[PDB]
């Protein structure tokens, strides 16, 4: 990863064993739960395309998922080549070439090239671009791995409202690979799947009530 | 390893106990699964030939694989000597058998630098590729979806074995075109054949969910 030394210079650092083992264990235990994507985004901080490829390569299982991820990366790389093409020709003696879809994914670029692109002024965040593609693929894989549907999440007869909400927004997070899920249909579905008593209470509470008030009403 | 210090100088650092324990535990747990080679490549970042020899030598078991690896290193060193007949490094100097740490540091930090560590790691990774391909427990032809097995697991084993076998991308693609679909259990196989040609992995896994 590109980290700043005390001198104020942006330098390259070998990926740490603690980070490697961290990512590996996250993929082992959490499988493809939504929270794995934030963790990834945090463990790949300041990472180069090489370091990202290291994190992804060290994954031993879920190889099918890794194939879907590779397909997605190729798609985003092609879209980069379409929207961001590089002029075939000479390069100024003092400048550096432009990255292709293969150069951002670290498959046709050397570590020194990636360092130059990431430390140039203005910088070219190839690591953040590649990380965004990887996070798109991971989003797709998480969405696919969703065990159940939000439609099948209903409050038990003698189940607390809090647990029902937990499984509700958990399952919805899994099915949408996101936590911003404040839709009218989503809310109406939350209130509808509730048990009859808490349903009448919530309906009586009125429209636009906060989740805090809703959970306070069905204590 | 050779690492850059905050003063901008390239200095020598001692290999860490964290890294040593890491590599040891990886070889212990994962044996020679493909993922072992990336991890190695990641723990040897900036390594000298002496550090690579340290990593390989701390391995307690798998002495057959280590002797094979020795042979491969000898082959690559002989080829290096043929190609390439302060001192200049020979095949034995890159593998750290006849060179001293200070000489390796000299070559690696020289200007222009002579990456002996990266060359040796290249040969080592080649030998490891051969060992992994040889230690694959099952062939891709015998990877067939069990009757009561989830399709996701079947493709996980399919592409795990396909990664262990290490073929060209054309052979891998060609394998997943026909061999992937044919080896599925009757249900998911009928569904897949009902989907159509040129379906993505995402679509196949979706249909058989």
């Amino acid at each position: 990863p590109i980290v700043q030394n005390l001198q104020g210079q942006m330098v390259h650092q070998c990926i740490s064993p603690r980070t490697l083992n961290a990512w590996v264990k996250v993929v082992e235990e959490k499988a493809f739960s939504p929270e794995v994507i934030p963790m990834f985004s945090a463990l790949s901080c300041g990472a180069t395309p090489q370091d990202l490829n290291t994190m992804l390569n060290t994954v031993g299982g879920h190889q099918a998922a890794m194939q879907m991820l590779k397909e997605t990366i190729n798609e985003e790389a092609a879209e980069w080549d379409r929207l961001h093409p590089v002029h075939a020709g000479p390069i100024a003696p003092g400048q550096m070439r432009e990255p292709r879809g293969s150069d951002i994914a670290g498959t046709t670029s050397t570590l020194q090239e990636q360092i130059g692109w990431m430390t140039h002024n203005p910088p070219i965040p190839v690591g953040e671009i590649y990380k965004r593609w990887i996070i798109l693929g991971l989003n797709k894989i998480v969405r696919m791995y969703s065990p159940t549907s939000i439609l099948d999440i209903r409050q038990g007869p003698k189940e607390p409202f809090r647990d029902y909400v937990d499984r509700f927004y958990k399952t919805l997070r899994a099915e949408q690979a996101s936590q911003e899920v404040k839709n009218a249909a989503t809310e109406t579905l939350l209130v509808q799947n509730a048990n009859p008593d808490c349903k009448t209470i919530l309906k009586a509470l009125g429209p636009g009530a906060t989740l805090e008030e809703m959970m306070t009403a069905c204590q | 390893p050779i690492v850059q210090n905050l003063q901008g100088q390239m200095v020598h650092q001692c290999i860490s106990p964290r890294t040593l324990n890491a590599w040891v535990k990886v070889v212990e747990e994962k044996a020679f699964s493909p993922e072992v080679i990336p991890m190695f490549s990641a723990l040897s970042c900036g390594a000298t030939p002496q550090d690579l020899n340290t990593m390989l030598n701390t391995v307690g078991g798998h002495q057959a694989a280590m002797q094979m690896l020795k042979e491969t290193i000898n082959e690559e060193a002989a080829e290096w000597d043929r190609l390439h007949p302060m001192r200049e490094p020979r095949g034995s100097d890159i593998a750290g058998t006849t060179s001293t740490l200070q000489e390796q540091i000299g070559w690696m930090t020289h200007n222009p630098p002579i990456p002996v560590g990266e060359i040796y790691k290249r040969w080592i990774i080649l030998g490891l590729n051969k060992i992994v391909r040889m230690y694959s427990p099952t062939s891709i032809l015998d990877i067939r979806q069990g009757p009561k097995e989830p399709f996701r697991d079947y493709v996980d084993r399919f592409y795990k074995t396909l990664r262990a076998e290490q073929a060209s991308q054309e052979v891998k693609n060609a394998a997943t075109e026909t061999l992937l679909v044919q080896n599925a259990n009757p249900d998911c196989k009928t569904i897949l054949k009902a989907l159509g040609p040129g379906a993505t992995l995402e679509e196949m896994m979706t249909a058989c969910q």
Partner: peptide, 10 residues
């Protein structure tokens, strides 16, 4: 010769 196990990158 083998092709490698580095699914991503080179």
């Amino acid at each position: 010769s083998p092709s490698g196990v580095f699914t991503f990158g080179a």
